[PDB]
Amino acid sequence: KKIVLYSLTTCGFCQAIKKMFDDLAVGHLCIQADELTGEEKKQALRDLRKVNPKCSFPTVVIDETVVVGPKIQEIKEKIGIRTEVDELYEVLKKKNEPKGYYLNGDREKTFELIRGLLTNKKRYGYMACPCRLASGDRNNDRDIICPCLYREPDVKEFGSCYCTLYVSADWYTGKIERQEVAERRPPEHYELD
Amino acid sequence: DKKIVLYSLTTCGFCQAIKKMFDDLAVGHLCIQADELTGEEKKQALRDLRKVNPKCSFPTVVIDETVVVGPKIQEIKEKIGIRTEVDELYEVLKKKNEPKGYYLNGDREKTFELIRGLLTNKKRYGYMACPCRLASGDRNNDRDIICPCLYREPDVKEFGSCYCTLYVSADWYTGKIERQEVAERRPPEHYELD
Ligand code: SF4
Ligand code: SF4
């Protein structure tokens, strides 16, 4: 697959697409159009205009298909990128949505939280809460294995769990204030002394 | 000169963002990635953490005798004495735009990076050309894309955010509306390619 990424050093999403490519050892050509001369900029825009008439950044060309804008799932779909986070995202969505627990709509935040669940599943053997420190002992951590014991009262009182991974329909659609959620876990559960 | 300790988790996103700011501003600190430590070292880092934050929550930053619990980057910066040209411009943009109904994106990290882009563009061009667009460097050719651009008002009225997602409406901010992708509204003929 021949990939070209039209990018700008000042464009945050352009750098995130580039980062994903580098991390997954994807073979691509990145054009940081703003680092070019006045005439090279004109030529980069003419090349871009042929595949994206709006001359907008980011734009990804994969062989003969073009993905315009911050459409990370569509870019992944044309390149053939499938990770265990994508798999777990689908599983969690199917299981939780009928229960009224929606995954946070900020996809980039939810994806890093799911990556945290996976990192915890590998090192501990269970999906310990990604925004808490686990002990590594399953029995001590039983109340913070996701979904934790605190999700139900936290979502009922504030509209979201402690990591903001699961949110209610009201939190999702802004019908309630998106309040900060305090740590409900009894501090004694660490068994420090 | 201040003694700084950041209690962090490798699985905590904001923890790495606080650490990134420290490193980029030469702020010396101890970073404890509590989850990388052994079983008994986890209990001791939690004992040190518990003394300053009984709830044993991450992130937690200790600056001398003052403790900041949670993702409170502004509070951390005020206690250390961090005050950058981005902070200055953020305040100027906030005071000028909030009374008009144009709020700065609540994802404070993304807003700061956009403001850094505005500053990078002011330095290399002489004006704050839109950081998510390609500037020519000719003010007259870029006139419609000097921040705030000619397209902010129609984009925010129709989608709730400007093209870069720097300025958002109150409904976008609180989640009352869907946060849709904003397409490039600029007529491509303005680029004067041929
Ligand atoms: S707070 Fe949220 S992310 Fe953490 S364990 Fe509970 S449900 Fe899972
Ligand atoms: S799209 Fe937003 S960030 Fe870009 S110039 Fe317009 S108002 Fe400024």
- Closest Cα partner for A130 from A158, A106, A109, A100? A109
- Residue whose pair of structure tokens reads 């980011």 in the numeric block: A58
Angle at A135 between CA A129 and CA A140, to 5 degrees: 90
Using CA atoms, how far apart are residues A78 and A152, in angstroms rounded to an integer? 38
Annotated binding site of A for [4Fe-4S] cluster: 129, 146, 148, 161
Angle at B41 between CA B36 and CA B43, to 5 degrees: 110
Using CA atoms, how far apart are residues B132 and A41, in angstroms rounded to an integer? 15
The alpha carbon of residue B10 and the mean position of all alpha carbons in its chain are separated, in whole angstroms, by: 20
Domain check: are A43 and A111 in the same one?
A: no
Using CA atoms, how far apart are residues A38 and A79, in angstroms rounded to an integer? 32
The alpha carbon of residue A163 and the mean position of all alpha carbons in its chain are separated, in whole angstroms, by: 14
Domain check: are A124 and A29 in the same one?
A: no
Bridge partner list, A65: A62
**Looking at A36, A64, A80, which one is the last position of a domain?**
A80
Partner residue opposite A11 with nearest CB, options B131, B135, B181: B131
Of chain B residues 123-162, which have a CB less than 8 A from chain A?
131-137
Asked if the Cβ–Cβ distance from A56 to B10 is below 8 Å, we say no
Query: B96-129: buried (b, 16+ CB within 10 Å) or exposed (e) per residue?
Result: ebeeeebbbbeeebbbbbbbbbbbbbbeebebbb
Which residues, 6+ apart, have CB-to-CB distance to B114 below 8 Å?
A12, B105, B131, B132, B164, B165, B166
- Within A50-181, strands assigned E span 59-62, 65-68, 102-103, 166-167
The alpha carbon of residue B155 and the mean position of all alpha carbons in its chain are separated, in whole angstroms, by: 21
What CATH number has the domain bearing residue B103?
Answer: 3.90.460.10
Using CA atoms, how far apart are residues B38 and B41, in angstroms rounded to an integer? 5
Structural domain range at position B112: 86-193
Domain check: are A101 and A182 in the same one?
A: yes
Using CA atoms, how far apart are residues B55 and A192, in angstroms rounded to an integer? 13
What CATH number has the domain bearing residue B51?
Answer: 3.40.30.10
Give the β-pairing of B4-8 and B30-33: parallel
- For chain B, the domain total comes to 2
Using the Cβ of B16 and the Cβ atoms of chain A, whether some distance falls under 8 Å is answered with: no
3-state secondary structure B30-77: EEEECCCCCHHHHHHHHHHHHHHCCCCCCCEEEECCEEEECCCHHHHH
Domain check: are A54 and A23 in the same one?
A: yes
Q: Indicate the residue type of B138.
A: D
DSSP state of B160: S
Determined by which method? X-ray
Decide: A15 and A22 in contact? Cβ < 8 Å. Answer: no
Using CA atoms, how far apart are residues A33 and B61, in angstroms rounded to an integer? 39
- Residue whose pair of structure tokens reads 């994206």 in the numeric block: A52
Phi, psi of B103 (to 5 degrees): -95, 150
- Please name the helix (run of DSSP H) or strand (run of DSSP E) that holds residue A77, with its range, or none: helix A72-79
Distance from CA of B34 to the nearest CA of A (A): 7
Decide: A159 and A167 in contact? Cβ < 8 Å. Answer: yes
Tally of CB atoms within 10 A around A160? 24
Domain check: are B63 and B104 in the same one?
A: no
Domain check: are A16 and A91 in the same one?
A: no
Domain check: are A122 and A94 in the same one?
A: yes
Domain check: are B105 and B140 in the same one?
A: yes
Supply the DSSP string of B81-135, one letter for each residue.
T---HHHHHHHHHHHHHGGGT-EE-S-HHHHHHHHHHHHHHHHHHSS-B-TTS--
Cα(B59) to centroid of ligand 1, in Å? 16
- Atom of ligand 2 minimally distant from the CA of B148: 7
Decide: B179 and A174 in contact? Cβ < 8 Å. Answer: no
Task: Give contacts of B55 with chain A, Cβ < 8 Å.
Answer: 182-183, 187
A102: which 2 tokens?
């929606």
- Closest Cα partner for B189 from B144, B132, B155, B153? B144
Q: Taken in order A168, A170, A173, A174, is the CA torsion positive or negative?
A: negative
**Looking at B81, B102, B127, which one is the last position of a domain?**
B81
Distance from CA of A67 to the nearest CA of B (A): 13
Q: Indicate the residue type of B141.
A: N
- Please name the helix (run of DSSP H) or strand (run of DSSP E) that holds residue B168, with its range, or none: strand B167-168
Domain check: are A71 and A104 in the same one?
A: no
Q: What is the resolution of this structure in A?
A: 2.1
**Looking at B23, B54, B81, which one is the last position of a domain?**
B81
Domain check: are B92 and B177 in the same one?
A: yes
Distance from CA of A34 to the nearest CA of B (A): 6
Decide: A12 and B110 in contact? Cβ < 8 Å. Answer: yes
Using CA atoms, how far apart are residues A57 and A35, in angstroms rounded to an integer? 14
- Residue whose pair of structure tokens reads 């740590």 in the numeric block: A183
